[PDB]
Scaffold this active site. Structure first.
Site, PDB file in Angstrom:
ATOM      1  N   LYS A 139       1.030  -1.329  -0.088  1.00  0.00           N
ATOM      2  CA  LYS A 139      -0.016   0.078  -0.226  1.00  0.00           C
ATOM      3  C   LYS A 139       0.833   1.153  -0.130  1.00  0.00           C
ATOM      4  O   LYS A 139       0.919   2.116   0.997  1.00  0.00           O
ATOM      5  CB  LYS A 139      -1.009  -0.211   1.336  1.00  0.00           C
ATOM      6  N   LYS A 171      -4.399 -14.075  -1.084  1.00  0.00           N
ATOM      7  CA  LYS A 171      -5.361 -13.282  -0.205  1.00  0.00           C
ATOM      8  C   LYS A 171      -6.862 -14.022  -0.616  1.00  0.00           C
ATOM      9  O   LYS A 171      -6.893 -14.944  -1.356  1.00  0.00           O
ATOM     10  CB  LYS A 171      -5.406 -12.225  -0.980  1.00  0.00           C
ATOM     11  N   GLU A 200      -3.194 -15.848   3.479  1.00  0.00           N
ATOM     12  CA  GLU A 200      -3.932 -15.222   4.454  1.00  0.00           C
ATOM     13  C   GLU A 200      -5.285 -15.709   4.899  1.00  0.00           C
ATOM     14  O   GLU A 200      -6.059 -15.961   3.963  1.00  0.00           O
ATOM     15  CB  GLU A 200      -4.139 -13.713   3.544  1.00  0.00           C
ATOM     16  N   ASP A 221      -5.691 -11.922   9.234  1.00  0.00           N
ATOM     17  CA  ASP A 221      -6.335 -10.740   8.874  1.00  0.00           C
ATOM     18  C   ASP A 221      -7.509 -10.614   9.645  1.00  0.00           C
ATOM     19  O   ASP A 221      -8.500 -10.923   9.729  1.00  0.00           O
ATOM     20  CB  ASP A 221      -6.804 -11.097   7.454  1.00  0.00           C
TER      21      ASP A 221
HETATM   22  O1  LIG Z   1       0.727  -7.456  -0.418  1.00  0.00           O
HETATM   23  C1  LIG Z   1       1.706  -7.581   0.505  1.00  0.00           C
HETATM   24  O2  LIG Z   1       2.885  -7.934   0.641  1.00  0.00           O
HETATM   25  C2  LIG Z   1       0.904  -7.349   1.931  1.00  0.00           C
HETATM   26  C3  LIG Z   1       1.449  -7.867   2.993  1.00  0.00           C
HETATM   27  C4  LIG Z   1       0.918  -7.500   4.246  1.00  0.00           C
HETATM   28  C5  LIG Z   1      -0.219  -6.594   4.418  1.00  0.00           C
HETATM   29  N1  LIG Z   1      -0.699  -6.398   3.291  1.00  0.00           N
HETATM   30  C6  LIG Z   1      -0.370  -6.511   2.234  1.00  0.00           C
HETATM   31  C7  LIG Z   1      -1.075  -5.674   0.974  1.00  0.00           C
HETATM   32  O3  LIG Z   1      -0.469  -4.518   0.636  1.00  0.00           O
HETATM   33  O4  LIG Z   1      -2.203  -5.845   0.693  1.00  0.00           O
END
Ligand SMILES: O=C(O)c1cccnc1C(=O)O
Ligand SMILES: O=C(O)c1cccnc1C(=O)O
EC number: 2.4.2.19
Lengths: 284, 284
Positions: A139, A171, A200, A221
Site C-alpha cells: 500500500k 489473499k 492469508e 487478517d
Molecule cells: O501484499 C503484501 O505484501 C501485503 C503484505 C502484508 C499486508 N498487506 C499487504 C497488502 O498490500 O495488501
C-alpha cells in the site's frame, strides 16, 4: 544507503518533481530577486523531532539542479538519526538560485521519507521486548515504492515483498477463486515451489485448515487479540516452523498487545499510506 | 472529469504503479489460482466514510490492464460524493485475473485521492459561513501534483499555483536574498509585471511595509488569530484590493476562528503532505 534501484527510483522522482515545478516556465521570482553569482550557506533544519531519512535524496536534487560541483556539504547528519526540533540535518554552500529552485522538491521528498521512518521507529519502540518485527505492505504510492520501502527500513522495520512476483501471498480473492485455502495453497506450491508463500486467513477455522500444509507464513487478517493468542498457541503446538503475521486492525496503541501474543510480525499499511510529514525547512 | 493534463498524469502514475508490481515477475498467485476464462462482478467498496475522488483513475487502470473491452461498469458513483462506510463506489464485471492484478495500484490511487478530498471537505465545512476558501500549496509528492491538486478541488478546495512560473510568490529566502520585502516585491514587479504576485510576510511590520505597494496577495505566515484580525483591519483601511491568505499554524480545530477574521483564503499544506488514506477495498 540507497541501492542501485533505489538511486534510480530517486532520480526519477526528483526528475518528476522538478518537472512539475518548471513546467509553466522558469522560477521567475528567484530570477528577479537573486543574481546568478549569489551564493549562501543554507541549512536543512527540522521544525520538529523525529528520525531522519532521505538525506541523499537531497544531495541528488542539488546534483540535478546545480551539478555535482555546484555545491559543498559543510556538515550533515546520517540517515536514521533520531533528531530534536531545531537540529541542522545538513549545512551546505551553494549558488543561491539553484537552492531556491530545488528547495520545495528536496524538502517534499525528505519530509515525506522522514515521516515514514519516524512512524516506523515509533512502532518499533512499541513492540520492544517482544520478538515481533514491523513490516510494510504494497500500500505504497505509485512511483515511490522504492523510496517508501527504504524509509521503513531506515526507521527499523523490515520490508515485505516488493511486488507481485516477488513472493506469493494468497489473499481472500484467490481463496475465493481457488474455492479453498488449501486448494489455492497447493496450486501455488505446484506452480512456484521455489517461491516464498504467505497465506492469508481471516478465521481460526481457516487457520486450522492451513497449519498442516505448513506454509511459510500465515497473515492473520483482522484478528482480535484473543484470536491472535489462540493462533499462536495452535501454531506453537502443531507447526512450530510456520510464521505468523498480524495485519488489519492494528494501531500504535494496540501494537504491544498484539506483539505480546507472540506473533512474528506486524504488517502495518499506515507506515506507507497515511504518512505525516516531518516538518523541515531550508534556512538561509 | 479528468482533464487532458490530469489524464496523462494519471496514466503516468498507473504506469509507474503497475511496473512496481510486475518488475519482479508475473502475478504468480493469481495465475496459479484463477483461470484465464474467469469473470466476476466486483465492487469498490469503502470501509469508512468520506468523499470519493479518483474513480476515473480506477477505470484507467483497467484500460491499461484489461483493455477497454475487457470490462463492463454496471454502476458507479460520481467523484465528489459523500459516502458512508459500506458504500459501493463502483460495481463492474471483468476478467478476474485482470482485476486481481490491477487491484492494489487502483486502490492505492483512489484511496489516496479520496483521503485528500475527504480532508479538504472537512476544512471546507469548517470555514462554512465565512467567505474563506481552502487552497493548497506546493507541498505535494513528486509525480502526483496534478492528481493531488485535482482531489482538493473535488473536495471543495481551490488550487493555488501549480508550479514556480505559474505565478510569483516572494518567500522568506527571496526576502533574505533581496535584502528587503519591499526590495524583493519591486524587483519582481519590474521583472514580470504581467504575472500574478503574492508576497509572503511574517510580521505586521512587514505587512505595513508592503501594503502600500499594493501586491495581488499577501500571505500571512504564521500569524496568531489576533494578528490576522489586525491584518484584515489594516488591509480594509489601507488597500482594500489586496487579498489576504493565511498559511502557517493552521489546524482544523482553529480553522473557523481564522476564517472569521475575514481573510480571503486559508492555504493548507496538510491537505497534500500528511494525507490519511480513505480505506477502500475490492470485493468479489
Ligand atoms: O501484499 C503484501 O505484501 C501485503 C503484505 C502484508 C499486508 N498487506 C499487504 C497488502 O498490500 O495488501
Ligand atoms: O509555493 C507555493 O505555491 C505555496 C503557496 C502557499 C503555501 N505554501 C506554498 C509552498 O509550497 O511553500
Amino acid at each position: 544507503g540507497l541501492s542501485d534501484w533505489e538511486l534510480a527510483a530517486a532520480r526519477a522522482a526528483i526528475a518528476r518533481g522538478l518537472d512539475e515545478d518548471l513546467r509553466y516556465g522558469p522560477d521567475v521570482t528567484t530570477l528577479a530577486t537573486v543574481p546568478a553569482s549569489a551564493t549562501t550557506t543554507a541549512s536543512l533544519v527540522t521544525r520538529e523531532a523525529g528520525v531522519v531519512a532521505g538525506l541523499d535524496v537531497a544531495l541528488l536534487t542539488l546534483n540535478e539542479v546545480l551539478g555535482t560541483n555546484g555545491y559543498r556539504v559543510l556538515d550533515r547528519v546520517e540517515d536514521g538519526a533520531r533528531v530534536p526540533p531545531g537540529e541542522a540535518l545538513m549545512t551546505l554552500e551553494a549558488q543561491t538560485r539553484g537552492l531556491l529552485t530545488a528547495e520545495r522538491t528536496m524538502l517534499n521528498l525528505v519530509g515525506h521519507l522522514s515521516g515514514i521512518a519516524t512512524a516506523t521507529a515509533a512502532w518499533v519502540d512499541a513492540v520492544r521486548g517482544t520478538k515481533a518485527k514491523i513490516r510494510d505492505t504494497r500500500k505504497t504510492l505509485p512511483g515511490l515504492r522504492a523510496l517508501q520501502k527504504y524509509a521503513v527500513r531506515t526507521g527499523g522495520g523490515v520490508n515485505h515483498r516488493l511486488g507481485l512476483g516477488d513472493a506469493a501471498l494468497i489473499k481472500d480473492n484467490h481463496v475465493a477463486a481457488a474455492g479453498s485455502v488449501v486448494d489455492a495453497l497447493r496450486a501455488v506450491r505446484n506452480a512456484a515451489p521455489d517461491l516464498p508463500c504467505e497465506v492469508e486467513v481471516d478465521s481460526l477455522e481457516q487457520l486450522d485448515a492451513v497449519l498442516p500444509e505448513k506454509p511459510e507464513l500465515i497473515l492473520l487478517d483482522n484478528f482480535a487479540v484473543w484470536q491472535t493468542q489462540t493462533a499462536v498457541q495452535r501454531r506453537d503446538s502443531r507447526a512450530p516452523t510456520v510464521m505468523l503475521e498480524s495485519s488489519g486492525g492494528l494501531s500504535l496503541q494496540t501494537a504491544a498487545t498484539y506483539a505480546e501474543t507472540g506473533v512474528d510480525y506486524l504488517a502495518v499499511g499506515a507506515l506507507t499510506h497515511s504518512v505525516r510529514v516531518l516538518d523541515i525547512g531550508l534556512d538561509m
